Amino acid sequence: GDLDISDTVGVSFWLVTAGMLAATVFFFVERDQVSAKWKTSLTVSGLITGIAFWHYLYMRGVWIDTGDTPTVFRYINWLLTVPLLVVEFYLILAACTSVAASLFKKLLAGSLVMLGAGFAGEAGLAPVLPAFIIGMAGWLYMIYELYMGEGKAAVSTASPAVNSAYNAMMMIIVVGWAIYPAGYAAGYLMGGGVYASNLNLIYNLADFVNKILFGLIIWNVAVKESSNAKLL
Amino acid sequence: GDLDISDTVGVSFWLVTAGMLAATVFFFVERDQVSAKWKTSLTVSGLITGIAFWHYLYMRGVWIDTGDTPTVFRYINWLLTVPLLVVEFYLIVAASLFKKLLAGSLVMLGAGFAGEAGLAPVLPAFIIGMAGWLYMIYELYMGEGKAAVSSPAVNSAYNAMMMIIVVGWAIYPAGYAAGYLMGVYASNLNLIYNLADFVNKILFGLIIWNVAVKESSNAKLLEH
Amino acid sequence: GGDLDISDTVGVSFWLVTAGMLAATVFFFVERDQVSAKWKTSLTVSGLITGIAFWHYLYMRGVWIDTGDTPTVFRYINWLLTVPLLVVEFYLILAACTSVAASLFKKLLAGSLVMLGAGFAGEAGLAPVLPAFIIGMAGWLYMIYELYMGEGKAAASPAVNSAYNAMMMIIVVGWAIYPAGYAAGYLMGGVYASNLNLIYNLADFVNKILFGLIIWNVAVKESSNAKLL
Amino acid sequence: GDLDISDTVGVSFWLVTAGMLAATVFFFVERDQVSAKWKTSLTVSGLITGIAFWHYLYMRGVWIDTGDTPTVFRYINWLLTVPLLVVEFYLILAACTSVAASLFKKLLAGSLVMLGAGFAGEAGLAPVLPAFIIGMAGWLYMIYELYMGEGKAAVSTASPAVNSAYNAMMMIIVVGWAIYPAGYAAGYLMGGGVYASNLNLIYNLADFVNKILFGLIIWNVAVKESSNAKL
Amino acid sequence: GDLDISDTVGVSFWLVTAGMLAATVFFFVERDQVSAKWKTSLTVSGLITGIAFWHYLYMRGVWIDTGDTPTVFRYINWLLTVPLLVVEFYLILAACTSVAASLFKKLLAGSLVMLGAGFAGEAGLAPVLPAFIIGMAGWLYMIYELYMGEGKAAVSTASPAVNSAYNAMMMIIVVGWAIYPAGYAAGYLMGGVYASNLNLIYNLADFVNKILFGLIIWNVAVKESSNAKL
């Protein structure tokens, strides 16, 4: 049975699964193109893409066998991978800020509320819009604390590579992550049934941008910095 | 079809299965950032998560398929993994302590199993289980443990292995207690076991990793 | 559970190329330790191209044997994932030769996406077969154009030159087998299912394995030469 | 359904399967902890544990499914691994004596007689008692050749590591290997019926001792030498 | 159930499958015991045994389910692996002569005629005996070109290791490969198909020529790499 090109959510799942699998191999193998300062970052990136891979196989499974949005798998994957992205965030902060381990506590706290509220909405354990609002709070609390709350502590200019990582991190958590709540709105906040296709299409683009492309930017910083240190 | 959310135990199983997979990969890959002094410790850590992963697939499998607590899978998994944790201490008087810790661990698990499998009433089983566990902690003080291991990095490792067997390990008897010694609560029992395996196998290996990476970086830094 | 059907010529070809991508992937990933930092990402990308092909070859061949129909979607999804990856390789190479390298990447991607879009519309019956072929060649020739004339018309290293040529050579001579196969299938005025698949499978072998091999040969030579210091 | 605890043999296969899994990973991954002097040894060590894992999977399948002692799988496994262990013995002996090549041939001949006889017994192609004796002769001919025959050549303490590995080889053939004929006696040479439970339990233990544990001995010696030689 | 010991060839398939599995692992892992000169060699060797393994798994499936000879899996396996052994030969040849590229194309052409012929026979596409003679000609032409043709161009003392690898290559294509036609002869060239002998001989041939030949190269390479460091 060839892929059904009409099942475009079907195809999206397929594409992203391959993207996850590839990225995963790429992050692990390229660990040797970066130095000890950078290796653990690549491990975590690969680990994030890796877990998404397996969860993508299951997500696609259920879509195709039932045509229902795979909410529980979706959130289980976020539950597992969001904390690790937070760990990448922490790893970056620890290079340029005194408050890195305290921030990590609050960023984690943000993310759990963000995710729990989201899930409540989609699970029908809470009305959609209220749940969206609390979720948004969670996400925004993280942004707040990172740049305006406790995070305002240090913006150490010391390393061009660390500024890049820091820049990339901001970019991902602000515009990067914005794709998910966009997804949630499209699916649940237009006119009450669920617009299941557009929900999943957007979620799928968001995991690609946020798991694969973020990983990719960090690797590029990592390789560039690694190579300049070699020259010297 | 989609994962059934109302099955909290099923979900917990899923999550730790993934945690174990992830940790196993992480320990193996990260061996390249720790000196020869630490590599084997990371191997052993990866082995523990590895075995736990396979056993989590089956434990989960049983739960979804029948609703029964996978007691034998659980205990067999501990039987394979707990010895490897004790090995990690020997890697740190040594051969004597290992043998004593092993015996403790085996008395501990044996009694636990006895109770859960119905080969002994649960309370006496709990006491002998507790005795075995308690004997392990004892041997790390007045006993053969008062051999002040020369090496700060060795000490941070040892301290953290000291702490895990005391506070980390307590989650299991807590698990047993919840399930068998309250007013069987299979659901609560499996939730605490899951959490205990998660904390103890992942975080402990994370500790060793952390010490090892720090020690190794410092030692390559003094190579100037 | 029987022996491979010998009558089924298309099956044998799928089977073979499947194996070839499998071998190739292992080859490229393993051999990374025979090339320098300057070349390693190339080999990775090379390996990911063949690895992703491998998985899709497994599905393609299963679609063929179980139904006998042509695996258009699996075939195009495969190229959608691998072609940009091949363009990334051109970018990686071109990062030496010019400072305009990031521009070319953007343009070559757009060209190739058009090339595959046209082709797909053709085989999918979303657009008539012959005009689809035309827009197909447009994207392709546009790619070839921007490399030979236009922007890619720019320049300590005797290896980046061979790899450059390798690229210019393959995107012209190598990639040609694809529209050659499309013509064979849909442009004889039914659909020539077997010829199509045989040529595509042949093109994939040549362009994914043999291209990867050329880069490997350049990287290996350069790394052992630069080692003499 | 959960593992059945009353099926002792069943549990034994499960434990040993998993041990073979872990040890395979252990011996491969740990190769970067030993010098070029020892790597191939750890490779062969992981191969033996590796091949044994796959066979343990099948052996356990058979038992769980039929209750029959999985003879052919057992001896197929031994046929693939014993020659490898004999290869490891040759490598050690290479560092000790000039007679190393003929010893290897002699030992391979011994072990094949040994395994052939044992198998004929268990598969019912020969009486269980005489097969055992020929089995034992092959085994004993190996031991003889190491201790009194062409192997009385040179103990030659070239290295403290080579000397440790040599002695490890010398012990295992005797004390470690002895578990197998003991298991075979227990299963075929003591009763009315075949004592399959004991037989499988003892073989399981013997694979564990000889593949996993003996592999760890080579690993131990090899890590110590390599770390010492580096400084 | 337990493996069926009466099925000699069943068991034969089992034994070489596992040997291919082991040998693939051996060769990839052991690359860190040889220097850059030899690493690709070991990679090709692993690739040969790796392809063989996957094919042996299908070949055994076919022998159990049907009891028939898996002729197409076998030749498909050979079609993938022989070109690779020839690539290996070219790598050996390149350190010994300057006519290596010409030799590679010659030997490959030889080997495809060799395989196409044997297959045509076994598949029933061509009478069994003329097929044998033709396939045999392809082989012999390969042996012609190495000993008396373009191969007469040069030997090499440049290294005693390259000289060993050369010698092994010359030996293998003569005594090693000879096991294959012997098997065909056994199977199709006696009375009115001796399927067991054929398959036993071919499994033996794959073992000697893929696993054992591989081991010889590996050995040359570890000696040479170990001396090089000294």
Ligand SMILES: *C/C=C(C)/C=C/C=C(C)/C=C/C1=C(C)CCCC1(C)C
């Ligand atoms: C790897 C996955 C990542 C980094 C996922 C991030 C997901 C979010 C930031 C989701 C956010 C949501 C809101 C901010 C509003 C309520 C529910 C959401 C979950 C979809």
Ligand SMILES: *C/C=C(C)/C=C/C=C(C)/C=C/C1=C(C)CCCC1(C)C
């Ligand atoms: C990797 C798994 C580990 C380290 C498991 C450890 C389990 C224990 C320390 C359990 C202790 C128990 C008691 C002290 C009494 C009741 C039964 C218990 C076994 C689970």
Ligand SMILES: *C/C=C(C)/C=C/C=C(C)/C=C/C1=C(C)CCCC1(C)C
């Ligand atoms: C790994 C796959 C690669 C590099 C595929 C390349 C495919 C092409 C260059 C296909 C080109 C086509 C045309 C130029 C005409 C219209 C449609 C085609 C797709 C088959």
Ligand SMILES: *C/C=C(C)/C=C/C=C(C)/C=C/C1=C(C)CCCC1(C)C
């Ligand atoms: C990895 C497995 C190994 C090294 C197995 C060795 C098995 C033996 C040495 C068995 C010996 C036997 C006899 C000496 C008496 C006859 C029957 C036996 C085969 C089990």
Ligand SMILES: *C/C=C(C)/C=C/C=C(C)/C=C/C1=C(C)CCCC1(C)C
């Ligand atoms: C890895 C497999 C290899 C190297 C196979 C080699 C096979 C041959 C040299 C077969 C030769 C045959 C003849 C020389 C006569 C014609 C029929 C044969 C194919 C089996």
